[PDB]
Amino acid sequence: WFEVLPGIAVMGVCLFIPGMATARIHRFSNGGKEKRVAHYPYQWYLMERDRRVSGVNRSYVSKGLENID
Amino acid sequence: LLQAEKDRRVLQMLRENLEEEATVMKDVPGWKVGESVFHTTRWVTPMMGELYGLRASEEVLSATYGFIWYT
Amino acid sequence: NPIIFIIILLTIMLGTIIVMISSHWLLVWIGFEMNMLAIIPIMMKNHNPRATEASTKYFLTQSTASMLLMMAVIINLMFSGQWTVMKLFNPMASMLMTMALAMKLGMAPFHFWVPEVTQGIPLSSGLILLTWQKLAPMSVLYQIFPSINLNLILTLSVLSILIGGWGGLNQTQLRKIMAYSSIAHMGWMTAVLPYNPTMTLLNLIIYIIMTSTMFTMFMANSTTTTLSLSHTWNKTPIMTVLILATLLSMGGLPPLSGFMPKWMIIQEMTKNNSIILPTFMAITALLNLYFYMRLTYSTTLTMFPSTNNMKMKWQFPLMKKMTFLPTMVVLSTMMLPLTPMLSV
Amino acid sequence: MFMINILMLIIPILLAVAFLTLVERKVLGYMQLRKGPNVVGPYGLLQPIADAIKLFIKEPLRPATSSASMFILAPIMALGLALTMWIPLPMPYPLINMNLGVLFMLAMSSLAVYSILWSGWASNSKYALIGALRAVAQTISYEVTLAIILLSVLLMSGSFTLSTLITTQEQMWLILPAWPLAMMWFISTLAETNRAPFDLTGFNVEYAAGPFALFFMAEYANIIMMNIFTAILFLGTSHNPHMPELYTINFTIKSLLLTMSFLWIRASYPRFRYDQLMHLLWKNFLPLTLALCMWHVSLPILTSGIPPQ
Amino acid sequence: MNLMLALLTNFTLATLLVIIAFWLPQLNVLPFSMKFFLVAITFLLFDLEIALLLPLPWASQTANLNTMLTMALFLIILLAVSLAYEWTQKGLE
Amino acid sequence: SMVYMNIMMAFTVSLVGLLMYRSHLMSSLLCLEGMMLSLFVMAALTILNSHFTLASMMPIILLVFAACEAALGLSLLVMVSNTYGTDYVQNLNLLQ
Amino acid sequence: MMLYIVFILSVIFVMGFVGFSSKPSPIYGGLGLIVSGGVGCGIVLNFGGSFLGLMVFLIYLGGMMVVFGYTTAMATEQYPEIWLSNKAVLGAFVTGLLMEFFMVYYVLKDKEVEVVFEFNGLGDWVIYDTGDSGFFSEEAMGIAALYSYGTWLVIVTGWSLLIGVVVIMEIT
Amino acid sequence: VELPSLEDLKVQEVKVSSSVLKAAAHHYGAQCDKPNKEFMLCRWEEKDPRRCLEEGKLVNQCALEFFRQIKRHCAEPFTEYWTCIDYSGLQLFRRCRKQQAQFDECVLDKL
Amino acid sequence: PFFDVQKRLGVDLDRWMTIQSAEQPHKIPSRCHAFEKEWIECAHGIGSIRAEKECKIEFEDFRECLLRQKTMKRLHAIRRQREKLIKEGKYTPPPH
Amino acid sequence: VAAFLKNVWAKEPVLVASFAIAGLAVILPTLSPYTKYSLMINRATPYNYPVPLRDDGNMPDVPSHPQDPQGPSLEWLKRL
């Protein structure tokens, strides 16, 4: 009954990687931010706009209130 | 607000696609600049070829294919 | 079986209603699509492999006769996009319109579409159902009418009676003799249609009645020509005069009423100074009677009724609405002061 | 670095089932009063790494009675779509944010029947010619029993996409309104993926050591996938934005228990004797499926509880 | 733009492995049955009328509902009446 | 545009000599359903960009009858092969 | 990944039809359709419409093709062959295959070739022509299939499907 | 046809990010109400937005002072409010429900 | 022929899925929506036999709305107005 | 016919339960008043923009102020 417990802790740990990996990529690719999702064409229009006015070329950075004062 | 922030853009966008079109060639078999293809002098909505000319390097793909085939 | 034999028979006319009652190109797509799906089991019932080797030749013809129509339908979607049943706004589409539609009303092209189907079917009971497929696409042509290339429609009609006048000189199968001359009247009512589409249906109504009486008189015993020798002195001598009352009328002689549309077909066709074309058709219609003479010479002259087997028993067929049918098919030529007023 | 997300999902999922044939037997072992792999491991854990070496040493002799262009074509698609179906699946973040993906899983799984028709047909006679047909003929009957009751929960969850499916199950464990559907979900998914009660499943016996391993490796790939697909649908987990790690901790560990169920049901039951096997679908399953299909329409209407989208 | 660069790695990985499997590390130098046909035709009939059944969750965020209620139930009826006449004859199936 | 010119040649896979001929008669009925999807897509080009929003049912209801017509003629070729075993369209007995 | 990625699939979609246009010993004809219609499914997935093309996988490519592939085994029980391995197959495969690139060869590669064969320029973004942006309602194309006003279609088309079963509930 | 010049362009566009633009998003239009509905009649009732170019700047001008107003008086609970909703994913309005009161305690009070 | 049952008894079979601008379930128009509303207004009481000789104008710009035919002809020759003088200067305009 | 429900429910207890779900599903949407609350919500979901109109004399109702009690009351749901 004991020996099956190392059997569980191999294949089950082998699924822990990609959920950890992907959540440490898109978080890493946007600098500690989640990825902006786009499901409707009105939602994409913000990212199509805001990338052109972010600072140079990025959608994961913001301007804030202090931009135009 | 953003409606007023979009129509302002295309009046700018059509101008530099027209002002840089008037200065191309003043040919005797050339176009009268400012003509219309239609007869009815009204405001038709412009076409994707009229916003962006034959430039077509990245940014034109960045406009039409923006929502399409991913976020 | 006998419950759904009505239900299959019910949905055929349900198809051609939707063909008539619509303002929409996709419903008239569906219309004689489900008709072509409703005709197949009527061909089958006794499950003989000749009937299967006749319906499948009937099948993939009318499949294309469906599927070519939609290729015309998407063109005037790309050309002005309106879906009212009207002019097609493209001669490349109206060409694709008619000469696809002419398959189901089979013209002088698409030759063996009619006889190879109708011969080889054991169900000679009816097989009057191939009057419905003569009825439905005529109810589209009344609305396609004022956009046709005007030369294609008359070319198929002059050729129509030319082959149909020639086909039954080489025949004994009275099904094929009745498969032919179904090309004949379908050349005339196309040849009117550029000039007054009303009174086209006058040719259509007379053709229905004189074909309805023909197979009901053929549902006594006869399927072969020499089998029409052995009924005058065997089955009933009263049928021998009545079959001569119709074969001579459908040839078109003026004292009977079979001549009546061809009387009126010229009063419309001339007064628009087309003279050489009705003369070529009427002189071709002379040959339409030499099918019937050389056939009526067999049944009404007692040509050797051999094979001694006497029918002392009575007859119980279903002669449904039969005896009232050759009363407007003979003596109605005085009785039409205005058939072009109630129909038109 | 989008490419390194790809290789850190395809490669770490192969070891997820290459180390499962071990677990297949040990769970089978400790029911029968017997131990696992004893001499090689020591705890077993050194067994499949050596056995993976053998099937590429041992000579793959080819049939002279078959074509070659068709015979290796079915293992091409076997790793193709049965691994492609992993892609728009969240944990809690999917690789692709598809706007509709529940149709996309069924669109790929419908081509699973299109692989078995290859290998039996292009190879040989009888067994590989008639015996490989029936297995398509059972697995064509389990899409209508699959897709209809699938549609009956989208009526209440709200839409087609999978990202909204987590938020709508944050208080529920949605087996509770669909415990009749929970049987006919799990029974039907068991039957499609060719396992022990629903088995008749010559489409393997001709494969030597080379390409048998693929259609043993792809078939196992399906079975944890129907576990992970039932996992996000029925037994939804909690979500934390500030702590994404805590999602995946209690995510795969729930799918790993249902992974044992295919190993656990296999140790109980006999077969179903093919004539009954389709007879228990049309006569028995399917009329209840239409009834509950009518059930999940009227009740969100007669609640004024339509899910928003 | 990686969809389309997303599966291209997956399919080049499968066709790679067969070359190390079937190729270079090897180097060796129907009767007809009617009852097994009619179920495929029967399946495709119920395969069509679930695709017309398919657009339901978008058909709820809509206008006046009793049009969409009473008509969507009618397709299930035609899917069920089709069973019953066919239930009169299934064969050894 | 060129996207309309191709696909328009793709409609001319309904070549009639390769639509009822030659034998292996399943290859004939092959391009019949192959003539479908040359009309499903070609319609769905113009319906989609010119935002009609109402004729979206039209290509969907097209494919409903497209398989349903294709369902019928496949059944009859079994009835051909029921008494024969092979299709072989050069089979001909019933003449005109 | 270039600008011409939509058009270049369409030319590939043309050649999938030519693969079964002669006589591909009809088991490869199924493999002529799956390669075609999937690429044909790729063409529909542009231009806004996502949902309406993906069903063609299920209803036709998973639906019709399997039952299509379920035949040619219950019938045609002779010995098949790989196509192009004969001289009856390759006798016309190249003929229209030359014109498929020859149609592209001068539609726009010359300056003006000529009047009615140079009307449609290749590219560049006018193939889409979909600006400006839209709404947050749907695709749309998303609110596309409605059990509003079209109901006369559904009562007819469903009832046509019912009597299709009965005709196949009989003879076979 | 004709188009107006490069003049009556280059006016002060509100160069803010999309999250901080959707941050307030609710108190913004709910109190201005004079140029916007007039601009809607200028666009919906009468088409051709070339006779209609002037009031697109007027409603733009009102937003200029609007963010200048919130910056001068109460912005510290505002800057933390679009901080949490910047932590992305679908921009739900229930994750930042807690911090909403610290912003909204003074919008009815300070100004 | 066209019996028109739906005219007397006042229900529509469809009559809605007919033109480009009839229903639009959430008031979302089409691209050439503005020319349907004009071209119908031209010939309504016209009996269609003089309509091909009287209106003749609002059909044209409508038909060319659907294709943008000469617009594509006018735009393509700009690639021959410029872009044969590529090495002959005329960048026009400089970025941005 | 009273034992007819008790000589088939002890004989084939599968489709018997189906017809009971065929029942109790058609009848009840025409019964409880929770419906037509389904209609009031599904119409009061704003997709598009409510465009204002032009005044000329009247003014029957609804001046320019949005926060005035000038329109309907769908705010029962927030209180619900």
Ligand SMILES: CCCCCCCCCCCCCCCCCC(=O)OC[C@H](COP(=O)(O)OCCN)OC(=O)CCCCCCCCCCCCCCCCC
């Ligand atoms: C009025 C209020 C509204 C309505 C509410 C009513 C609620 C009703 C809920 C019903 C839904 C579940 C029932 C679904 C049908 C189950 C299938 C079935 O019962 O078939 C019975 C099967 C066939 O044989 P049978 O008809 O019984 O004939 C022999 C008679 N001695 O005979 C059998 O018994 C064999 C059982 C099937 C064989 C497969 C068993 C394999 C083991 C599977 C284990 C499943 C574990 C649980 C599922 C996993 C959880 C996700």
